[PDB]
Amino acid sequence: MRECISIHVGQAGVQIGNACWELYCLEHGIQPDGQMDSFNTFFSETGAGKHVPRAVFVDLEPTVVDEVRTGTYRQLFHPEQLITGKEDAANNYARGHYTIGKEIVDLVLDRIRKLADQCTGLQGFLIFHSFGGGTGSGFTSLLMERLSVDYGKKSKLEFAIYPAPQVSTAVVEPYNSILTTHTTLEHSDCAFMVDNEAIYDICRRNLDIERPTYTNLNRLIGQIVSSITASLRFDGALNVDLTEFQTNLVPYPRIHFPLVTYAPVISAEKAYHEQLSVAEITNACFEPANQMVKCDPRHGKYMACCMLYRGDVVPKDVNAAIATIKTKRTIQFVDWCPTGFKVGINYQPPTVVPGGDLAKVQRAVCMLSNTTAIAEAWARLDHKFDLMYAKRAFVHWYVGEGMEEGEFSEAREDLAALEKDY
Amino acid sequence: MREIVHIQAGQCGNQIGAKFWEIISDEHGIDATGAYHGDSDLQLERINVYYNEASGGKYVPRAVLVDLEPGTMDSVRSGPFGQIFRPDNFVFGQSGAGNNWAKGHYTEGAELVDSVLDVVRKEAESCDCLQGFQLTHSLGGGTGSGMGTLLISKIREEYPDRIMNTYSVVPSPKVSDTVVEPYNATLSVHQLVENTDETYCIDNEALYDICFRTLKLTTPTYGDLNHLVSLTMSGVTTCLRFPGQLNADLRKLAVNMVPFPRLHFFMPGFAPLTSRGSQQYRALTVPELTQQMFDAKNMMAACDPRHGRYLTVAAIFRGRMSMKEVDEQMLNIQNKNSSYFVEWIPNNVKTAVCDIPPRGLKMSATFIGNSTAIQELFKRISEQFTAMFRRKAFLHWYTGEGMDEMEFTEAESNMNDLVSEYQQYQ
Amino acid sequence: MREIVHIQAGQCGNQIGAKFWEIISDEHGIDATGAYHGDSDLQLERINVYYNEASGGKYVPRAVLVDLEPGTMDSVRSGPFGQIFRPDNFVFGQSGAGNNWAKGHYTEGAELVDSVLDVVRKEAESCDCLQGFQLTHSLGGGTGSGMGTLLISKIREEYPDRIMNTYSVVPSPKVSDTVVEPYNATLSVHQLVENTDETYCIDNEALYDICFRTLKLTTPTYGDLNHLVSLTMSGVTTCLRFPGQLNADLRKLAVNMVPFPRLHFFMPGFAPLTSRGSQQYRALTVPELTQQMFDAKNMMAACDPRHGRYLTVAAIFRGRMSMKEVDEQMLNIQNKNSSYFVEWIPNNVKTAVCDIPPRGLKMSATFIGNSTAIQELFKRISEQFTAMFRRKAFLHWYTGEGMDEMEFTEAESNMNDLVSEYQQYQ
Ligand SMILES: Nc1nc2c(ncn2[C@@H]2O[C@H](COP(=O)(O)OP(=O)(O)OP(=O)(O)O)[C@@H](O)[C@H]2O)c(=O)[nH]1
Ligand SMILES: Nc1nc2c(ncn2[C@@H]2O[C@H](COP(=O)(O)OP(=O)(O)OP(O)(O)=S)[C@@H](O)[C@H]2O)c(=O)[nH]1
Numbered sequence A: 001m002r003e004c005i006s007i008h009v010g011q012a013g014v015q016i017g018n019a020c021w022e023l024y025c026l027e028h029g030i031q032p033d034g035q036m037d038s039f040n041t042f043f044s045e046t047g048a049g050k051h052v053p054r055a056v057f058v059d060l061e062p063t064v065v066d067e068v069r070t071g072t073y074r075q076l077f078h079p080e081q082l083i084t085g086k087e088d089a090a091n092n093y094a095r096g097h098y099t100i101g102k103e104i105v106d107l108v109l110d111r112i113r114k115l116a117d118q119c120t121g122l123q124g125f126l127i128f129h130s131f132g133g134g135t136g137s138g139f140t141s142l143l144m145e146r147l148s149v150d151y152g153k154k155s156k157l158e159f160a161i162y163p164a165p166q167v168s169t170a171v172v173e174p175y176n177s178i179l180t181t182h183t184t185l186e187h188s189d190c191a192f193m194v195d196n197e198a199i200y201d202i203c204r205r206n207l208d209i210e211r212p213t214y215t216n217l218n219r220l221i222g223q224i225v226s227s228i229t230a231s232l233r234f235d236g237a238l239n240v241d242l243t244e245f246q247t248n249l250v251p252y253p254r255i256h257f258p259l260v261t262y263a264p265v266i267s268a269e270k271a272y273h274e275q276l277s278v279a280e281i282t283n284a285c286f287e288p289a290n291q292m293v294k295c296d297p298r299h300g301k302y303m304a305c306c307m308l309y310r311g312d313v314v315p316k317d318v319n320a321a322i323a324t325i326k327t328k329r330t331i332q333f334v335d336w337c338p339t340g341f342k343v344g345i346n347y348q349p350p351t352v353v354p355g356g357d358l359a360k361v362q363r364a365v366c367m368l369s370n371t372t373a374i375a376e377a378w379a380r381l382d383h384k385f386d387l388m389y390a391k392r393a394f395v396h397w398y399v400g401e402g403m404e405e406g407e408f409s410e411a412r413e414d415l416a417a418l419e420k421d422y
Numbered sequence B, C: 001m002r003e004i005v006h007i008q009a010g011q012c013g014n015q016i017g018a019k020f021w022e023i024i025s026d027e028h029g030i031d032a033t034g035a036y037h038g039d040s041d042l043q044l045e046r047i048n049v050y051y052n053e054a055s056g057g058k059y060v061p062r063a064v065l066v067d068l069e070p071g072t073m074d075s076v077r078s079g080p081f082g083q084i085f086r087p088d089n090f091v092f093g094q095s096g097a098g099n100n101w102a103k104g105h106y107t108e109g110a111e112l113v114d115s116v117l118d119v120v121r122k123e124a125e126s127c128d129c130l131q132g133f134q135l136t137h138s139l140g141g142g143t144g145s146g147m148g149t150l151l152i153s154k155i156r157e158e159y160p161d162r163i164m165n166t167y168s169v170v171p172s173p174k175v176s177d178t179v180v181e182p183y184n185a186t187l188s189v190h191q192l193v194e195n196t197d198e199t200y201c202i203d204n205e206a207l208y209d210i211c212f213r214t215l216k217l218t219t220p221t222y223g224d225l226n227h228l229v230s231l232t233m234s235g236v237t238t239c240l241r242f243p244g245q246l247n248a249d250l251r252k253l254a255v256n257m258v259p260f261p262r263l264h265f266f267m268p269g270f271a272p273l274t275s276r277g278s279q280q281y282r283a284l285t286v287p288e289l290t291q292q293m294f295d296a297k298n299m300m301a302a303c304d305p306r307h308g309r310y311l312t313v314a315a316i317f318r319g320r321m322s323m324k325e326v327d328e329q330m331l332n333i334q335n336k337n338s339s340y341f342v343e344w345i346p347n348n349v350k351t352a353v354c355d356i357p358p359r360g361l362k363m364s365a366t367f368i369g370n371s372t373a374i375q376e377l378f379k380r381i382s383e384q385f386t387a388m389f390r391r392k393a394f395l396h397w398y399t400g401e402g403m404d405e406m407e408f409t410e411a412e413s414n415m416n417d418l419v420s421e422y423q424q425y426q
């Protein structure tokens, strides 16, 4: 026995946390109130037939928190773990990092500290947020360094909604993205991808949902986190811990930004049309378009590859499929990283939702790597930042939060050094 | 939560605010008296932003009515939905500045500043958290501009952190309704560069031509102008008032629209706008709107952005569609309008969607954009001011209210610096 | 228990006391005759404070009616609730001082002092324990002020330990109803600095303006003034009359309001005060009252506290709310009104709540505060007295009643010392 803590900041973070808790509740049979020992990794035993999520819901705006506390799962969540803000940063990293974040970071730090107090087997921290959101950038970053300074070497996992190259809710998104990336770089143990446009494209072409909604995105995150945490929440042939995830993909602290991909995303009518075998599902998932990242991995080199099989998957078939994956030349690896393969097998089949886009299947695989194509996105973001900051636009907004342009500039050069480190 | 207090100045401003209030009563399911009858919880969940907690299951608008004459006062109160306002919010003068900025700002504004500050402070304190303000007035008029300037000054010195927007009505270049209206615009802009965080410029002749041609009406009226104004109204404020997959507020727009403190003038937008025998034949799809987002026909403040360059664009949507279509449409808009767009502000389209469409339309789209086209308007205003100030005509009315020469000189210098900065951006 | 005897002087005082008595009959469930019909035990549990044990299941007010003329006598007795008073409490003169202090205090007061002392002693002895007294009169009037001075002197020499309050009516500065009213105010205050433990100053024009503007009445009358007076009435005395989570009495207020024996003048307060078409639209919450606690509009005794400094504030509440909201509201009131407040009296807000709200209102709030604003009123009175005493005009009427020069000199010297001490506090 062991536990983990999930952190949700901003609208995207709150929605993601709610969806993930919906998964964890329906997978273990939790009714909306909390009733009917691996489920203790995310829920706490007190009283009689009771469980509550080990999470904190915080946002500078109370709209999403109000929406959460109006669902049928009010009884499921403790009221005190929901935090309501008053002044949304409005896509401003500095606003949510200094003006409102500094006076509300205390209660959250403080009581996630108790969440660790009753969880002596705290494996790590889960963070869900968005770069585009000013709250989800600033408050998330500051609480990230607060976690680092209050826990030391404790493992921490970040799930960030990176704005897409052509999808941006706010035009000031480069400022928030660059600022948060420079601020939390040294402490970000592992940060993933989310490309909204790639999610929409995959849903429209794979699930063939011409009119999807953010619920599809919500379980897109939900299924990813479920596949990641199945090892901790269910036994398997070779379970994988959170520590090994950062051990394999962080030989150097500078590069800790791996991309994620799921296989498969198939509707029930199309699930009738295809049953999964290891070779086909892996080679489909390794296909660049199947990746939920809008960056072709074949442009650069591959760091490492991690497989997360769940269900009735034969390890020998895994080895054979992975080998025949290796031999083909569409896949290339760095010279000094010949053997960077880790496989995690779990016996728990992926869980379905009623009325969901995904189809109920006994087996699945999670696609886990850090390709060099992320450098393309980083360079494009840096170029956009240079263009839109060259005339110094929207800077006065961050100035009114009380800093001058210097920190913007050296964050730009820090991220440039990160980009050229490849 | 995030309460917004409405203050209306001038006859046009009072009419605009009233029409807004009936439109909000439609959108939130409020009858002519104040009772709620909406069929969905979404209308009444965030009713407190524009309404207050009234006894007997009622709601009253968070509005402040200011004028120097009670003529439009009586017409508005005796008009539709006049009983939804308490008599206390109606405070009026008895002299009238007579389309004079100095009179309405110093002579008659001296005995109205106390009342307007008292009522706005009462509205601010009686609410939970005042997110910001919204003011409507006409820069062509003299009194309304003076009330706008006085209120923005008092708000800035009282609530320097609470942002707002001013929906001022710039006089039409084609028609000189008032001889001394250049002074009014001069002083109003000189105070706006200084006491307002962001401003939308609403020009008459552009909406007149839209009603004439786009709507295909042979008899345009103030009613249609107030209707489109209320559509702009709802389009900007629906993200805060109504739940959305991409939630937004006035603070988000202000952050996304203001690159420099003095560069805060933007030109609002609305679409689609089609008649009965075109709507049943037009495509009710996004491309029909994206061809309508960028055009000099459905264009708001009479200065063509094609001559200048767009600073950045904000687009709010209300309906049932996916988001990626919007993103690719914005990308195509950049791809084809690159020359009309600015090269050094990549992805300058601000994308957000409110889930709830307005009453009677399953889409509405509000185009919030900024371009250096307003440079032409400001330069023409400056040269007109120079033209009839070189002759020193009609200065006696202002100098009789405690005016001075070099004051107007630094006013015109401020607009000169503003237009020079806008040209430098161009 | 803690019985209070009411004595009314002058026509205005008699009307005020009567209106009080009907209001108490409402609050305690007493009909026009005296029978009890209240629906709760709380009304009739402490009825003995203002009523006496009457046979046949009846109750009569503990009131004393004094006048020098029977005109208002007959109107009051023949008016509503006139049968609830025994004929013995009505004692009247037959001459009338004619708005003269000296006449009503020496000439006609000589044959009324015996009667008033006899009746007040009968009321005191017939009761269990007389907690204190309450008197109503007008300082503008001559006779009423003389009766007030005589009664406070006799009470002080007879019951020096039993505190009271006097609800005197200071003449309005704007209107000179009586030419010799400055003498009346002079002598009344000279006796009040000396025979009264604490005094509330009630000024006409302030309540007149409140009825005109705050209540929005085009025809203010004495009835509304007496109504608001009876609200002040109930607001002060509800803590003693009715059970409360924070029980209080007149002794608590006197201890909390009097820092120096000569510094005992305070300016009462009432809220909320809203009309039919504002009450159904206003917020029936505490903040709507706390914005109404501190204002020159709903303000009682015509001198602005903003110019001066508050000494200390007492706030009594009647309704259904928690107490911490009141405490934090008082803290915010300090935080924002620190300049208007006194720095060397920290936490100068006296907080108490009576559980039972008045009839017809689920909150009423009575603002008992003290400020150095009354310094302006006293200084203006002193300078007026100097102005028309330098000319020695209208002195013959007073000197014919046994008056003298340096007596008025030490009177004006006493007000000079009082105003100097108040300025020193400021
Ligand atoms: N993938 C995904 N992203 C979402 C979802 N909801 C919101 N987002 C992200 O949120 C961004 C919009 O801004 P928010 O993060 O909501 O900003 P906010 O919550 O208002 O916080 P502030 O900007 O500080 O006021 C978008 O760019 C999205 O990337 C969702 O359901 N799915
Ligand atoms: N769109 C629109 N414009 C209006 C409306 N009413 C007046 N206007 C415009 O406003 C301008 C006059 O502004 P106005 O507010 O009337 O000046 P004013 O200073 O307040 O006039 P006064 O009170 O001193 S007499 C005119 O050019 C007119 O076209 C209206 O209802 N809708």
Ligand SMILES: Nc1nc2c(ncn2[C@@H]2O[C@H](COP(=O)(O)OP(=O)(O)OP(O)(O)=S)[C@@H](O)[C@H]2O)c(=O)[nH]1
Binding pocket: C009, C010, C011, C012, C013, C015, C016, C068, C069, C096, C097, C098, C099, C100, C138, C140, C141, C142, C143, C144, C169, C171, C177, C204, C222, C223, C225, C226
């Ligand atoms: N609020 C209020 N004020 C009143 C009322 N009646 C009289 N007054 C005020 O009291 C003042 C006169 O005081 P008053 O008591 O009538 O003098 P008086 O000395 O008793 O008059 P007299 O008996 O010698 S003839 C006037 O200024 C008047 O405004 C009343 O019913 N309500």
